[PDB]
Design a protein around this ligand. Structure first.
Ligand SMILES: Nc1ncnc2c1ncn2[C@@H]1O[C@H](COP(=O)(O)OP(=O)(O)NP(=O)(O)O)[C@@H](O)[C@H]1O
Ligand SMILES: Nc1ncnc2c1ncn2[C@@H]1O[C@H](COP(=O)(O)OP(=O)(O)NP(=O)(O)O)[C@@H](O)[C@H]1O
Ligand SMILES: N[C@@H](Cc1csc2ccccc12)C(=O)O
Ligand SMILES: N[C@@H](Cc1csc2ccccc12)C(=O)O
Ligand SMILES: [Mg+2]
Ligand SMILES: [Mg+2]
Ligand SMILES: [Mg+2]
Ligand SMILES: [Mg+2]
Lengths: 260, 260
């Protein structure tokens, strides 16, 4: 009989597509040797053939998808003024206030893309024709309780369109085309707001403006937008049991354990 | 005569390829109106035609270049244990110790890619055939004095090869092919170490191992590697006078002022 410690070890080495039962009559040492051999070969095949990281490749695919639909690619600061958090309406009553990684007296690791995207919408409205369509992909940071669906360091896609065409129907069409393009199953459930669910897992929250918060950011036009976690998309696509297999990590490469 | 404040404002709106003299007999208001019109049209052309961010696009081009040469694409944590810094031999005597953005009691924003790349080399050596070639592109953080060549939030390329073929000649060949591919002029000047210079500007530091530090990271094979700042490459390629035009920013998009 395997110990729970031994089964923990085998589960680290187990890939979703593996056809192995750890409840068999096989000794730990030889189940482990089998899985070690398979994972080494998996890494060898990646190194020989494609060599691209899941998170980088997904960012590049998403980037191509939004650029092709007319959205401008933004890369804004990850280290942001703490003031931006308060100006988003996040006060101690809100959950997110206690999730902030503070850095100095006045700065934090951004937990969200909305402040920077607001600032870009306001500035670009002076230069670009209506409608203004922008997106960003990059690191975001939140303190979280241990969870199979949460990372403290994750990667967010945020997109926003401002001006004409900012209907709920158009927002749902973007989301739907996007997830059908990636091959990810979803249901949309719904200051209009909606969530994009995969079972009980939240892939995205989306919104339709105007909302009263817009005025603090110098925004006075309708808008639609949404934010998606890349690691949650990878977790669904590859059927990972824990989102740590999709994270920036020293412990996993493309969902394969690096502790061999 | 223009005030220095007025010339500061015009210089924000001035692009390197602009054929305008601020030392002319033209009034500020109409020099400003001219440059505002040009910068709005520049942004309009980006939005109409390509829509890609300089920093994202450069990362993707570099990524294609190293993947095609057989390097595995790594995406490792940006928030790293503070311990990694000490284990790199960075003590109070070294300059970098006081440049660290600390986050909690035990974590920091990585100022460098070497710790994570060391850990990947050690782990992948159990699985991959000799030689082991890896690279990473992503955010790094250092506290710096105000400078035309330094950002506190920048983007690093780091690559490393371990095992056979780890000669200085091979390292110089990679660097040379890489910068000739990007169209960036350079001179290589030289525990063997060398710097890749563009005039007085350091594009890269590179190294040849083994070095004694390797043992602390579980490394006991020869290696070659280098690190490059992406914003410095953009600054050179686009002839920006200040590296802030190439940064993750709310103030510049592809080197164009967003304050129009
Ligand atoms: N800690 C996290 N780890 C991974 N992805 C995350 C995390 N927090 C948010 N995301 C993703 O970012 C999207 C937009 O953020 P947001 O709507 O603020 O999330 P949220 O409401 O806190 N979701 P949740 O914490 O799961 O109830 C989410 O739908 C997730 O896909
Ligand atoms: N603050 C920074 N802003 C932008 N790029 C940077 C910064 N620090 C380092 N880099 C880049 O990263 C490369 C490798 O880092 P490193 O060799 O540690 O730099 P460095 O020795 O501190 N260079 P410098 O500070 O200019 O004398 C450098 O050659 C630069 O291209
Ligand atoms: N609130 C999260 C997700 C998000 C980015 S743009 C955006 C627009 C509408 C809804 C959500 C988002 C965030 O601010 O990152
Ligand atoms: N020291 C910097 C640059 C770098 C990355 S891998 C590497 C290998 C050799 C020399 C430099 C580097 C760093 O650690 O990021
Ligand atoms: Mg949450
Ligand atoms: Mg949500
Ligand atoms: Mg320095
Ligand atoms: Mg150096």
């Amino acid at each position: 009989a395997l110990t729970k410690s031994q089964t923990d070890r085998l589960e680290v080495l187990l890939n979703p597509k593996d056809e192995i039962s750890l409840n068999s009559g096989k000794p730990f040492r030889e189940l482990e040797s089998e899985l070690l051999s398979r994972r080494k070969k998996d890494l060898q095949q990646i190194y020989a053939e494609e060599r691209e990281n899941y998170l980088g490749k997904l960012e590049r695919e998403i980037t191509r998808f939004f650029v092709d639909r007319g959205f401008l690619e933004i890369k804004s600061p990850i280290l942001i003024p703490l003031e931006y958090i308060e100006r988003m309406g996040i006060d101690n009553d809100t959950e997110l206030s206690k999730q902030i990684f503070r850095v100095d007296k006045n700065f934090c690791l951004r937990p969200m893309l909305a402040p920077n995207l607001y600032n870009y919408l306001r500035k670009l409205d002076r230069a670009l024709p209506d409608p203004i369509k922008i997106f960003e992909i990059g690191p975001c940071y939140r303190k979280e309780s241990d969870g199979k669906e949460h990372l403290e360091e994750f990667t967010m896609l945020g997109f926003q369109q401002m001006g004409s065409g900012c209907t709920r129907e158009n927002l749902e069409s973007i989301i739907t085309d996007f997830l059908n393009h990636l091959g990810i199953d979803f249901k949309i459930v719904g200051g209009d707001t909606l969530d994009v669910m995969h079972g009980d897992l939240e892939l995205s929250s989306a919104g339709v403006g105007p909302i009263p918060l817009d005025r603090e950011w110098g925004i006075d036009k309708p808008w639609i937008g949404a934010g998606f976690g890349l690691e949650r998309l990878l977790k669904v696509k590859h059927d990972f049991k824990n989102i740590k297999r999709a994270a920036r990590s020293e412990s996993y490469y493309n969902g394969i354990s690096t502790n061999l």
